Design a protein around this ligand. Structure first.
Ligand SMILES: Clc1ccc(Nc2ccnc3[nH]ncc23)cc1Cl
Ligand code: NI
Length: 316
């Protein structure tokens, strides 16, 4: 039955949030390896799931337009105020990006040059659970393939929300669904390889060892360094994944995930090499040092600054 909407087709069903495109570019944020749940199903219209509902998003120079599909048969309508506040928080639109870009730009000429072309890169505020298991799937992987795994994971273990066209949207599973005796085998069947072990084992560990998803919520109010350390006790969660989660889901803007790509950017575009270590390649200690470097340079929103560069390095 139900079809993916565009702003032309069904304007009655859209609400808008004042938002300069220079504070937010959907095309630089939603598929730049923060969330893996957004797809441009028709041009300049992005559809994906947010907290148990499907949205479609598009924008002009000065407005962010959105529509919500509730599925569980309700009557069709525009977004409510509450839903719009959900969306405002997801894009952390209280935070001014113009001021951050200008502050980063003032100590960093490399940034200033790349930041001209790549405005409106900001950090999503994601659900901890979805973010943890998504980034467990990120090891030795690329966005396209991670997106594939996460999709199949959600279809197989998460509640069906709605279907639009040929796309069936599922909510992100809960810990208990991922912790079960078959979960690893099923996830292997779904193409996750060794990552399947870490999904099930981390689901199991968060439940039994940490008393379930309220623990992740506690980490949101815990300090960065305590949150990071705690996450690294989990199967398949090391410094990189923990930093992704910290930055993207636990409101730690100073977290800087270091993987082979941030290594590459740091060395190529900043001329950085490990100093306080001898070993010249990536290593846990050198990776830590690189994160410290960027905090030192950019300040307590270093992770946001890094996201600009990451997002810019994905486009040629
Ligand atoms: Cl395969 C893959 C996909 C996405 C990411 N994501 C990031 C890593 C570091 N800093 C970031 N800032 N914003 C996104 C992002 C990593 C991998 Cl390893
Ligand atoms: Ni060199």
């Amino acid at each position: 039955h139900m079809r993916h909407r565009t702003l032309s087709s069904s304007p009655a069903l859209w609400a808008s949030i004042p938002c300069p495109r220079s504070e937010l570019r959907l095309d630089l944020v939603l598929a730049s390896g923060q969330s893996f749940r957004w797809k441009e199903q028709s041009p300049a219209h992005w559809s994906g799931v947010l907290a148990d509902q499907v949205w479609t998003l598009t924008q002009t120079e000065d407005q962010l337009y959105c529509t919500v599909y509730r599925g569980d048969d309700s009557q069709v309508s525009r977004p409510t105020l509450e839903e719009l506040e959900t969306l405002h928080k997801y894009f952390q639109l209280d935070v001014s990006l113009a001021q951050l870009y200008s502050h980063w730009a003032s100590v960093d000429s490399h940034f200033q040059r790349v930041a001209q072309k790549f405005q409106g890169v900001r950090l999503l505020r994601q659900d901890p659970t979805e973010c943890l298991f998504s980034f467990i799937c990120s090891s030795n992987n690329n966005i396209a393939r991670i997106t594939g795994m996460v999709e199949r994971l959600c279809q197989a273990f998460g509640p069906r929300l709605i279907q639009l066209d040929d796309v069936t949207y599922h909510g992100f599973p809960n810990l208990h669904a991922l912790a079960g005796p078959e979960a690893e085998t099923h996830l292997r069947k779904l193409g996750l390889g060794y990552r399947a072990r870490y999904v099930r084992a981390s689901a199991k560990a968060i439940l039994e060892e940490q008393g379930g998803p309220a623990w992740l919520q506690q980490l949101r109010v815990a300090p960065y360094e305590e949150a990071h350390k705690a996450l690294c006790t989990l199967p398949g969660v090391g410094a990189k994944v923990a930093d992704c989660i910290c930055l993207m889901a636990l409101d730690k803007p100073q977290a800087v995930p270091v993987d082979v790509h941030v290594w590459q950017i740091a060395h190529r575009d900043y001329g950085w090499h490990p100093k306080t270590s001898q070993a010249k390649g990536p290593s846990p200690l050198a990776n830590k040092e690189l994160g410290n470097f960027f905090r030192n340079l950019w300040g307590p929103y270093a992770g946001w600054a890094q996201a600009v560069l990451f997002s810019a390095d994905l486009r040629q």
